[PDB]
Amino acid sequence: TILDTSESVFKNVQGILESFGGAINNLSGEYRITVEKYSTNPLRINFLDTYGDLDLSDTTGRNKFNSVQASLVDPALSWKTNSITFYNSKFKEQDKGLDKKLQLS
Amino acid sequence: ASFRDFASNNSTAFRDAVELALNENGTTLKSLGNS
Amino acid sequence: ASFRDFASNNSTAFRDAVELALNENGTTLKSLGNS
Amino acid sequence: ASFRDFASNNSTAFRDAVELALNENGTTLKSLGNS
Amino acid sequence: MRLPDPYTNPEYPGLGFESVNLVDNDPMIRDELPNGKVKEVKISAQYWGINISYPELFPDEYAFLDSRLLEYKRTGDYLDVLLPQYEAFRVRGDTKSVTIPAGQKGSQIILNTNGTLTGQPKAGDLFKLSTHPKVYKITNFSSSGNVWNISLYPDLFITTTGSEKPVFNGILFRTKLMNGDSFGSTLNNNGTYSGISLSLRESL
Amino acid sequence: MRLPDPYTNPEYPGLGFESVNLVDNDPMIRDELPNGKVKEVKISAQYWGINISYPELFPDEYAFLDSRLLEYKRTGDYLDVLLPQYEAFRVRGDTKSVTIPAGQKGSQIILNTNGTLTGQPKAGDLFKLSTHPKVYKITNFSSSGNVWNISLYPDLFITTTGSEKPVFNGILFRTKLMNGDSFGSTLNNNGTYSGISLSLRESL
Amino acid sequence: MRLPDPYTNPEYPGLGFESVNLVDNDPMIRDELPNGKVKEVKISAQYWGINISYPELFPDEYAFLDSRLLEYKRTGDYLDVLLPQYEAFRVRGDTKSVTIPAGQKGSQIILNTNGTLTGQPKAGDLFKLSTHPKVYKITNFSSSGNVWNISLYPDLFITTTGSEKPVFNGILFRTKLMNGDSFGSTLNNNGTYSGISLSLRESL
Amino acid sequence: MRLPDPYTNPEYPGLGFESVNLVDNDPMIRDELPNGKVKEVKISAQYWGINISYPELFPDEYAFLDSRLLEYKRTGDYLDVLLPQYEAFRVRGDTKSVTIPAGQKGSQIILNTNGTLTGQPKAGDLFKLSTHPKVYKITNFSSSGNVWNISLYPDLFITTTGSEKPVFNGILFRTKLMNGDSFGSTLNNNGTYSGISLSLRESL
Amino acid sequence: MRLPDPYTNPEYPGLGFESVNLVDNDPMIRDELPNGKVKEVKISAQYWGINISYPELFPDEYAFLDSRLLEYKRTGDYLDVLLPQYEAFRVRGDTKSVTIPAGQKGSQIILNTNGTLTGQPKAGDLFKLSTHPKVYKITNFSSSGNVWNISLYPDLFITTTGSEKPVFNGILFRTKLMNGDSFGSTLNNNGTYSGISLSLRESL
Amino acid sequence: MRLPDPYTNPEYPGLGFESVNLVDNDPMIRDELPNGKVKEVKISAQYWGINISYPELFPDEYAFLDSRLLEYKRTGDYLDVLLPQYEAFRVRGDTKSVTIPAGQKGSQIILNTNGTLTGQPKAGDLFKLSTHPKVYKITNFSSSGNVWNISLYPDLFITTTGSEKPVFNGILFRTKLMNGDSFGSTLNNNGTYSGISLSLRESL
Amino acid sequence: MKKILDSAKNYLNTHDKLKTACLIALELPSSSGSAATYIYLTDYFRDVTYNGILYRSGKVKSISSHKQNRQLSIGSLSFTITGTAEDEVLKLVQNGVSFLDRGITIHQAIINEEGNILPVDPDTDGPLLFFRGRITGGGIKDNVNTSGIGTSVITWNCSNQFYDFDRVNGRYTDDASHRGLEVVNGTLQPSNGAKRPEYQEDYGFFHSNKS
Amino acid sequence: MKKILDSAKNYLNTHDKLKTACLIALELPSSSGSAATYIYLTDYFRDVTYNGILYRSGKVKSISSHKQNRQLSIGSLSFTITGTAEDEVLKLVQNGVSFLDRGITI
């Protein structure tokens, strides 16, 4: 990484994160760094343990994509930009063949 | 309904209430004068 | 509370009430299409 | 009136209600981090 | 300062409490989960609320009562209220030779009477420490020799320092007069004052 | 703990319910379809609600009652009550030798008295399992010799583990007070506490 | 399931309907234009609302009624309500040899009685099909030979398949008990239960 | 259609208005100027409102009444009513040979009886044109021989086309029900439907 | 136009004012500063509000009153209201030879009676100018020879042009009928009309 | 100005308070601390509030009263009132030769009569300084020969300048009307104005 | 101006009480794109047959208002199902199912005296169209009250083709994007991601990276 | 997952009426950076001793809700003092005093 120190501290931290997941948390006193992961022993919540309210919301539009196109500064080239593009046949077999591309950098 | 008139009589409060949730992150509404 | 649902049913009024306090100065919300 | 305090206690709902009328067209409030 | 009652001032019989209302005010945050379990949370303090009602008052009775209330509002003192129904004398003797071990911050007083007190307090009576103005009600009492085990409804508002002395008789509520912002009394054409009510709150 | 009543404390006949309101509280996701059909889904647990009203209480009886209630508020446990209209001892015998086969959920229940109980529990009477504190209400009864088939209005909260024993007499509701936050008592010039009432609510 | 009434259960005379309230619930969107023309729009269905009031109930009457209501709430069945004022027997005979032509989806039933039915239905009576639980009121009736022209208030909730059979007598409302979320009854010190009301709604 | 009443159905004397409220409903843009002057602009159309209250209705009379009302609700037409206090037959004769010259707008109207009518319509009586269903109210009358000059409170909704005939008797209000959405009837133990009332409202 | 009263129309004794209510409506912006000084601001005008109540009305009395009210609502005129209690004749003579100097815009009229008027007006009477319809009450009156110093409650709504003539007797309130948007009267089964009220406002 | 009353105008005995309500209005920043202590800060000025109720007023008495009130509303000055229950002339003499030493703030006040006054002002009586129009209330009195020590409920609004003279008799409250905006008077058929009442409020 | 049959112009002018029903036809969210199942629903109290299709009742509760300005914008509509059907709940909350591009057509039907559909649209001689678009969103709102009546509402979100305003559909000059390359087992093989099946053997943009 | 002692996991599961107190410790706004004075406060009705520190009562009135998303943002909290203490008022409204970087632990 290169951190342009002329940027703000808040924006620099926000840019260091979102590159590996990450979420700075100030709860319970300390600063805790948490990244996305899968566990074989998660905490079991039944709906009867809740307060009775429940809101389900799935925004498949504007958030579900079938293919990704990314770019990066690759030292294989003379530190120029290289594009990584690939599709998924299963995700396009689903969604009735709609063409939706995820753009990343 | 008749809520439009009311909101039009309390616009500055709406602006402040909006800018108070954007300051949670680093966003703020004073960045529109550039554009 | 249950205010979220209501506001989600009157969004355009909120937008107008916001844009009415930004026009006090030279700011306006139609300057977001550029970005 | 005493509406300012209330709105200051429900700011996120105001932000969402605003961003819900700007998404009608292609505008959104997440385009302020650039500026 | 003592609120005028027909104990100290029997010449004004209209100053008696036509009806008292000892209100238990203990605000709590009560939440009922869908699984049928009701859960409570207590943070704030408990304060005894006293409401006094009065009959028609003659000019002299009202003059005395109003002079006392205005003296209260002038010096900013604390009205003391005496409830006759709580003045049953059970424990008699000296409360200076009794010792209370220190460090007691729960909802229970353990005291060694040292055999200097006759009788035993009854459950539901009024109990108070000598160094704090808060008034307690005895919910249970077990005596094993000279050491007494008095249980109190409000959790001990102070941590015993070892110098406190229990007070069983002559207990007064260090109240502060509420509803004094708009306090008035209408004088009828027959010369008697009507519509006088004292909403008092225990301001320890 | 036990709520005082003339059965536990016969010396205080003023205690005892002047009127008891046993309400049924089953929350439900009711939906009124446009075609006329009404669809309701039961998710939240059901709980009996008990509203007790007391007659004119003399000062000593009220002292005992509020002492017990303040002990309740202090130690924070549950407050058991015994409704007397459901105290018709219609089933004699000792229920220890009565087995309830394990693995039973729902309204229906099967228990084998093994030729021990005498008396038939008619519909409308109360029923309670030995372990769980929930109180049910028998809606229909049918017996084939020693085996008894009982249908209960609330579904069995816990599945029988083969050791739960029936309790056809002396059923106590594990309740919690709902008037605690602001509970006042008025004293008349006649010398009695008037309008004492409780809004209880079964917990779990 | 039938609601207990003094037809099936005359031994409990307190179970009679002290006053019934047949409520016509047909929600409509009514808009009044400034030109004086009032305009209505109907989308939702019409459901008959029945409200039952009861007098003071003795322990046995209340026990029976409560057992029936708890059985209802247990099995999730449908309470059937019989109104005596609508039990005038005019049409008598067999309703199996009568034929109803199919495809009738309006607000009018044309049926060929085939001369098997004696008498004629009167306007304002209660009419119901054998394959649907919705209850209809006859608003008009014209007979031209054996074919009858019965006009009904609620628009036909089903399209006739040709197998439906008209029902004129013995009509019950397939109701579902509303206000059952908080259902209770206070027991007075004299032994009688008071404050019992059934707000029923026709859940077809 | 016609609302049943003792004139149309004398066999049902229970029908008939116990009390009728004929309200005047003229919406207006009223403005209270700061100088004391009150300015009101009439834009929305005026409409008479009729509130009918019925006496104790026996079951058969109510059956007829609600049958007619449900036929109204079914076929969706208008519901005509005849107020009996305005049924004083003060004008004899046949009005077919009475001509109203065309091109007349506003409160004033001129009609030529051609020496046919007998009787003078005094102020306060009703008036209605043959074609339009609006009902007016005569406020002043003045006749010069055969020609009659009548002033009506509501301005003529439609300009006379030279063929409209006066209707001085048997005037029916073309109304619409306003209690239809929730219309319930209670049956007493005495055997009568009590408190039946209608809130009608003239349409157009 | 004059409202019917038992002066002009004594044949209808039911048209008398059972109770009048002269309401002083002078809207002001009143602000109370924390320093105990209450401050007022007056911008809008003062208008006399008159409320009339009526007893049960026979058909002829109601017919006359309703005809007059409908004539008012038809021509859009101004109802004139006469209060008998303000009809004491003190000042008598000619009001045409009296001169009022021009330029008087305050709250005080200085007029030279020129010795043409006998008697003197009393404080609290009703006074009105001949060129404006607003009604004034005399709050004070000092006479120094022929020039009178009449003080009026409402600030002069007009600036005197020198041609105005004082009016002391026969003063009418140029009112406009409020609550006419929904104006009605219920006719009871005994033939008398009830529930008639006139809320009038001085529309100068 | 002076509010009319039987002392100023004995010819009108209808004037005079049927009932007077002298309310105490001290705004305060009261705060209820979580520990049970109640903290209140006095910032806003205190002001006596006077609610006057009149008996049945005959037309001439009401004419005088509302003439005076309308003169008040016109000239805009303050309206003085004299409460008669505090008119017990308990202090004889002329108070001009009574000196109040300068530089005194707070409730306490010291004044030297120089052997002029006869009579002791008991607690509950009124007191007012010559210059400032505020009205206080004596709460306690103590005299050592000629010097008098008086404690007043409201703190001295202005510090004594050495020239203010005591006023123990004829104390008038400088009040302002609070019912002016909508003040109506009803005239009965009996001939009296009923329910006339005033909500006064001391200004400054 | 959407033209209306003159026959409907008489019914809409003479009759005051209009019985209107909205016929909804949404495509089932399915895990794969195979087949096309439709659920037909109506807001009317009885089922309505249109073109031989039985629009069953008892599920739909409310429909939102369709608004269109003169500025390009997504046309959002919201219709709610009862949420206690327990057969519509599982379709929405099913795992591994996507409804990214499932359509929905809503008709506005007027019922006659005899119970039939009054013809309005001239081209079809049937009812008008209220809305036709795509399903973009959804949700269910459970509210269990510990004392009283709870409610559950399933709301489906709808919009037109421009729902994703941040969408860049273009043929970027690259072999990997032009042929829709994807690793299948151990090689980058062309797939169906290409805009045309004939793009799978097009090597035109092979040397575009070094050009 | 902030781990909790198993002993507390029994109390939080068996007892229903929980008596909770929030112990506030804020640094005094001082004109200079010299020294570090602390005011210790509590929301409980009686003073609570923790690590030998007496958290005095009678001042704190309410505390806000601490919310944390998965997007970087300032974590705002708001606790209110009575405002009639007249000893906390002067500390806030004092002239020439700055509290730019004064901490608080709750």
Cβ contact, residue pair H182, G36, below 8 Å: no
Contacting E residues, span 183-202, partner chain A, CB-CB under 8 Å: none
Q: Please report residues of I whose CB lies closer than 8 A to that of J59.
A: 85
Contact call for residues E90 and E113 (beta carbons, < 8 A): no
Phi-psi region of J16 (alpha: psi -120 to 50; beta: other; left: phi over 0): left
d(C-alpha E172, C-alpha E48), whole Å: 12
Cβ contact, residue pair L15, F203, below 8 Å: no
Strands (E), J126-181: 126-129, 135-144, 147-152, 166-167, 173-177
Q: Please report residues of B whose CB lies closer than 8 A to that of A11.
A: 26
Burial string for D7-29 (b: 16+ CB within 10 Å, else e) reads: beebbbbbbbbbbbbbbbbebbb
Tally of CA atoms within 13 A in the half-sphere of C15 that contains its CB: 20
d(C-alpha H124, C-alpha H142), whole Å: 14
Strands F28-32 and F38-41: antiparallel
Report which residue type is found at K15. Answer: H
Four-point Cα dihedral I126, I130, I133, I137, nearest 10: -20
Report which residue type is found at I75. Answer: T
K93 forms beta bridges with none
Four-point Cα dihedral I109, I112, I116, I117, nearest 10: 30
Phi-psi region of A62 (alpha: psi -120 to 50; beta: other; left: phi over 0): left
Question: Residue F158 gets which letter from DSSP?
Answer: S
Contact call for residues H87 and H126 (beta carbons, < 8 A): no
Four-point Cα dihedral K2, K3, K8, K14, nearest 10: 80
d(C-alpha F14, C-alpha F55), whole Å: 7
Q: Which of K51, K53, K44 is closest to K21 using CA atoms?
A: K44
d(C-alpha G168, C-alpha G92), whole Å: 9
Strands G135-144 and G147-152: antiparallel
Cβ contact, residue pair E158, L19, below 8 Å: no
Which residue does chain F place closest to G185, by CA atoms? Answer: F21
Contact call for residues H59 and G20 (beta carbons, < 8 A): no
Q: How far is CA F68 from the centre of its chain?
A: 19
Instruction: Please provide residue I66's backbone torsions phi and psi, each rounded to the nearest 5 degrees.
Output: -70, -40
What's the full length of chain B, in residues?
35
Tally of CA atoms within 13 A in the half-sphere of E35 that contains its CB: 10
Cβ contact, residue pair J204, I36, below 8 Å: yes
Q: Please report residues of L whose CB lies closer than 8 A to that of B26.
A: 72
Which residue does chain H place closest to G33, by CA atoms? Answer: H44
What's the full length of chain K, in residues?
211
Contact call for residues H49 and I184 (beta carbons, < 8 A): yes
Task: Name the one residue in this structure whose structure tokens are 């632990």.
Answer: L105
Strands (E), G113-192: 117-118, 126-129, 135-144, 147-152, 166-167, 173-177, 182-183, 186-187
Strands I182-183 and I147-152: unpaired
**Both structure tokens of H158:** 């439609």
Distance from CA of G29 to the nearest CA of F (A): 14
J152 forms beta bridges with J138
K20 forms beta bridges with K110
Sign of the alpha-carbon dihedral angle for K102, K108, K111, K112: negative
**Both structure tokens of A99:** 């063409």
For G140, which of H43, H71, H182 is closest by C-beta distance? H71
Distance from CA of A32 to the nearest CA of L (A): 10
Contact call for residues F174 and F133 (beta carbons, < 8 A): yes
d(C-alpha E12, C-alpha E58), whole Å: 9
d(C-alpha L16, C-alpha A75), whole Å: 62
Residue J89 CB: number of other CB atoms within 10 A?
9
Q: Which of H197, D2, K151, F85 is closest to G185 using CA atoms?
A: F85
Strands G126-129 and G166-167: antiparallel
Contact call for residues G95 and G167 (beta carbons, < 8 A): yes
d(C-alpha H66, C-alpha G48), whole Å: 14
Phi-psi region of I102 (alpha: psi -120 to 50; beta: other; left: phi over 0): beta
Question: Residue J2 gets which letter from DSSP?
Answer: B
**Both structure tokens of G29:** 């969107």
Cβ contact, residue pair G187, F37, below 8 Å: no
Distance from CA of L78 to the nearest CA of J (A): 17
d(C-alpha H55, C-alpha H14), whole Å: 7
Burial class (CB in 10 A: 0-12, 13-18, 19+), I68: buried
Report which residue type is found at J21. Answer: N
Distance from CA of F43 to the nearest CA of E (A): 8
The secondary structure of J5-72 as a DSSP string is -TTT-TT-TT-S-SEEEEEEE---EEEE-TTS-EEEE--SPPEEEEEEE--PBPHHHHHHHHHHHHHH
Cβ contact, residue pair B25, L76, below 8 Å: no
From which experimental method does this structure derive? cryo-EM
d(C-alpha E178, C-alpha E175), whole Å: 9
Helix (H) or strand (E) holding G64: helix G59-75
d(C-alpha H82, C-alpha I31), whole Å: 57
Helix (H) or strand (E) holding F29: strand F28-32
d(C-alpha I119, C-alpha I185), whole Å: 45
Which residue does chain L place closest to E29, by CA atoms? Answer: L17
d(C-alpha F76, C-alpha L68), whole Å: 34
Cβ contact, residue pair G156, K147, below 8 Å: no
Which residue does chain B place closest to L70, by CA atoms? Answer: B25
Contact call for residues K79 and K103 (beta carbons, < 8 A): no
**Both structure tokens of C32:** 């977001």
d(C-alpha J152, C-alpha J125), whole Å: 10
Which residues have CB under 8 Å from H180's CB, separation 6+? G24, G26, G28, H73
Task: Name the one residue in this structure whose structure tokens are 């209060």.
Answer: I83
Tally of CA atoms within 13 A in the half-sphere of K76 that contains its CB: 20
Tell me the angle at which helices D11-22 and B11-22 cross, rounded to the nearest 10 degrees.
100
> Between vectors from CA G184 to CA G179 and to CA G185, what angle results, nearest 5°?
130
The secondary structure of H100-130 as a DSSP string is --S---SSEEEEE--S--BS---TT-EEEES
Sign of the alpha-carbon dihedral angle for E54, E55, E56, E62: negative
d(C-alpha F68, C-alpha F1), whole Å: 9
Contact call for residues C32 and D28 (beta carbons, < 8 A): yes
Q: Please report residues of F whose CB lies closer than 8 A to that of E25.
A: 181-182
Q: Helix or strand or coil: residue E189? A: coil
Which residues have CB under 8 Å from H126's CB, separation 6+? H83, H86, H135, H136, H137, H138, H171
Report which residue type is found at K135. Answer: I
Between the CA of residue A25 and those of A20, A22, C26, what are the distances in Å?
15, 9, 38
G197 forms beta bridges with G53
Burial class (CB in 10 A: 0-12, 13-18, 19+), K116: middle
Contact call for residues G165 and G129 (beta carbons, < 8 A): yes
Report which residue type is found at L65. Answer: S
G126 forms beta bridges with G137
E20 forms beta bridges with E52, F187
Q: Please report residues of J whose CB lies closer than 8 A to that of E157.
A: 35-36
Residue G1 CB: number of other CB atoms within 10 A?
13
Which residues have CB under 8 Å from I22's CB, separation 6+? I48, I49, I50, I83, J184, J185, J187
Which residues have CB under 8 Å from I106's CB, separation 6+? I155, I156
Phi-psi region of F76 (alpha: psi -120 to 50; beta: other; left: phi over 0): left
Burial string for G146-155 (b: 16+ CB within 10 Å, else e) reads: eebebbbbbb
Q: Which of F133, F141, F136 is closest to F106 using CA atoms?
A: F136
CB of B29 within 8 Å of any CB in chain C? yes
**Both structure tokens of I129:** 């100018």
CB of B18 within 8 Å of any CB in chain D? yes
Q: Please report residues of H whose CB lies closer than 8 A to that of G49.
A: 184
d(C-alpha H61, C-alpha H59), whole Å: 6
**Both structure tokens of I64:** 């006359």
Q: Which H, E and C letters describe chain L, residue by residue?
A: CCCCCHHHHHHHHHCCCEECCCEEEEECCECCCCCCCEEEEECCCCCEEECCEEEECCCEEEECCCCCCCCCCCCCCCEEECCCCCCHHHHHHCCCCECCCCCEEC
Q: Which of A96, D28, A70 is closest to K166 using CA atoms?
A: D28
d(C-alpha H42, C-alpha H154), whole Å: 11
Burial class (CB in 10 A: 0-12, 13-18, 19+), K17: middle
Strands F126-129 and F193-194: unpaired
